[PDB]
């Protein structure tokens with residue numbers, strides 16, 4: 008039994024392993040999520056592969072229940088075990104209280120796990136941050152984020168990953184009410200977002216939506232070029 | 247209208263300055279002489295008067311006298327030694343032993359005593375000159391200023407309140423804290439206010455090449471310190487001049503330790519420096535040797551910590567008074583935003599926050615310019631910050 | 641022949657030397673530790689034999705050394721590096737001290753604070769005979785020291801040296817004298833003329849020289 012304290016206090020009141028783990032988040036690939044009034048949509052950027060092999064295994068967007076989708080950033084290995092324990096927990100809610108899980112409840116589970124996981128012995132903290140999107144029962148779409156310290160935190164839209172503060176500046180500099188008027192207009196907002204942060208708007212995008220009553224749906228790379236094409240068309244006539 | 251008329255009449259008189267200043271004689275730029283119109287009074291008299299009667303009078307060093315008779319023993323730089331004599335122009339009083347004297351080349355006899363050798367690399371660290379830092383500028387640590395100042399200057403400015411009470415005031419004091427806290431800056435105020443010889447020493451200057459070479463610099467330093475009436479000796483970064491004796495196996499760092507031991511012996515043991523006050527300053531005091539930490543050498547042990555809130559606000563009033571700002575800002579919010587910070591960091595927030603006003607086109611900085619300074623200097627440069635492993639002084 | 645004092649550096653080691661210098665009408669002769677260290681070679685050696693030459697001349701004479709560890713560092717075998725000249729001067733301190741052609745004409749008083757640094761060839765039995773230690777004062781000597789240095793000050797008879805020495809452990813003569821001077825200053829801070837007990841009580845706190853950090857939340 009490797010009984011040793013790891014997370015100790017700094018002489019000025021800081022947790023060095025925590026704030027290094029947030030840097031390991033800060034070098035991860037950029038993922039952006041927004042919410043619509045009727046259809047939520049999110050997508051990771053920087054697929055960054057050799058573009059000559061497989062890819063379904065690198066999909067950084069998973070579901071937890073029918074109504075709960077989830078993406079993340081940071082290092083890949085620590086994420087999926089949190090995904091597994093979250094799936095066991097959200098199944099165990101249904102083994103208990105009969106309704107599906109609320110996104111606020113499952114995010115309190117994740118952040119509550121992560122905090123005591125920093126409080127424990129002999130453990131480096133997790134080096135991931137996640138965006139958790141769910142349209143709950145009675146159709147109130149919302150989302151949250153997860154700090155590596157474990158502070159669940161609601162948003163109307165957010166963006167984490169390498170080069171995310173400028174993307175957040177674009178989102179506050181661009182988010183209106185009528186931006187969430189049409190669903191494809193919201194997708195045009197997200198593709199407008201990633202595009203001006205992920206530079207070359209090729210096949211690096213990986214978007215996935217939910218119409219608040221369905222499962223998740225990932226568009227094939229045809230509406231990527233279609234929506235990017237009409238985006239460059241609208242910017243082309245705008246210029 | 248007289249465009250060329252002021253031009254050429256300006257130009258021929260600006261040239262005609264030089265056209266008769268060659269007739270003065272200022273020309274033939276030298277290799278180390280002097281101007282022709284100066285020494286013109288050593289022209290016929292002292293040319294034959296400071297030269298033709300005046301000797302060379304080579305300077306020497308006395309070994310000893312002997313009884314009942316003058317019959318001195320001389321010593322010179324390379325040559326032999328002699329039995330020599332006074333002149334009639336000198337008394338036999340001030341020809342004490344171990345003294346340099348001026349000696350003619352033929353009879354080899356003594357003309358005038360000389361001041362001793364000073365090794366002028368020690369003379370280089372006499373300050374000769376004062377900085378401008380006022381105790382107004384050292385705000386936030388007023389009781390440290392007072393508790394220091396009563397040791398430094400009150401016996402020197404008033405040597406009667408200690409005599410008529412019947413106490414000897416303490417003679418040694420060190421200053422220590424985290425870096426950038428205002429230690430060196432605090433010493434500059436002392437060098438501002440005082441009047442005696444302020445002989446600074448930076449500890450890394452004493453690392454010499456030869457063996458025991460630094461110890462002679464210590465000895466000469468305390469000798470010319472003893473020559474004066476009252477004197478102030480400043481020390482800085484004395485961790486380099488000694489931490490502690492730890493030696494084992496292959497003897498390492500010994501040469502520093504001999505110099506540190508010579509510093510100990512010059513501080514205490516067999517006749518005190520008397521009217522000589524010392525002043526040390528370090529970053530980490532933990533490494534220092536306890537015999538150096540003994541009082542009688544290091545009587546006062548002034549702490550420099552971080553300011554609580556009000557010292558910080560006072561420091562904002564110091565570094566922020568002399569810049570064009572928005573009038574209705576508050577500093578108390580900023581001192582709420584800086585829990586653990588130095589006056590150097592506060593100054594960098596001020597001098598950066600002005601540059602934010604210089605960014606676009608304004609003349610007076612704003613509260614949100616200050617907010618752009620705080621997250622950058624504190625929270626963007628927070629990766630290094632230099633403080634926490636120095637809070638424990640390790 | 642040849643005594644050695646040692647101990648913690650505040651117990652008073654120079655004080656006996658200047659005491660005996662005030663007592664005997666002998667040719668006292670002082671030294672420093674690194675005074676026998678020269679830039680050239682052999683000059684400290686010739687300096688040692690000059691010292692015992694003049695001390696050999698004055699027949700009533702005792703010799704003193706302060707801070708012997710500046711030269712008496714224990715020898716060691718090492719290639720590639722290492723001082724040697726200090727070991728030269730130490731070796732003529734050994735032989736010129738004792739060995740070939742000895743005498744009983746000079747007497748040796750040596751002083752250090754640390755012992756384990758020393759080459760045991762100078763701690764043999766006959767070079768340095770009486771190795772005496774200086775302990776820290778028990779309680780009554782702590783009352784006695786501040787009783788001594790409290791002589792030349794205006795002192796009201798409020799003081800309790802048993803109370804002060806009992807509430808002050810772990811001090812030396814330097815720190816106990818430092819209580820006397822700081823109590824000698826705080827009375828001038830309040831402008832008083834004589835000394836009271838609480839002045840000493842604050843001088844205790846200043847000599848202890850604690851770091852203040854916001855600690856009232858106990859008990």
Ligand SMILES: Nc1ncnc2c1ncn2[C@@H]1O[C@H](COP(=O)(O)OP(=O)(O)OP(=O)(O)O)[C@@H](O)[C@H]1O
Pocket residue numbers: 383384385386387423424425426427428429430431432529561564588589590591593
């Ligand atoms: N109380 C203060 N008031 C105003 N300025 C301060 C104060 N304390 C520190 N500073 C600023 O911090 C800077 C560093 O001062 P100083 O050189 O004395 O630091 P220090 O405490 O000696 O640490 P170091 O040894 O690293 O220099 C100074 O330029 C000064 O402007």
Ligand SMILES: Nc1ncnc2c1ncn2[C@@H]1O[C@H](COP(=O)(O)OP(=O)(O)O)[C@@H](O)[C@H]1O
Pocket residue numbers: 514515537542648649650651652653654655753785812813814817
């Ligand atoms: N009765 C006493 N006992 C112990 N120490 C004393 C006594 N009286 C005075 N002292 C202090 O002891 C100091 C002597 O220092 P000392 O211990 O010889 O230093 P070091 O041993 O490091 O050379 C004096 O400065 C003096 O203030």
Ligand SMILES: [Mg+2]
Pocket residue numbers: 426429430431
């Ligand atoms: Mg400094």
Ligand SMILES: [Mg+2]
Pocket residue numbers: 515652653654655751
């Ligand atoms: Mg001593």
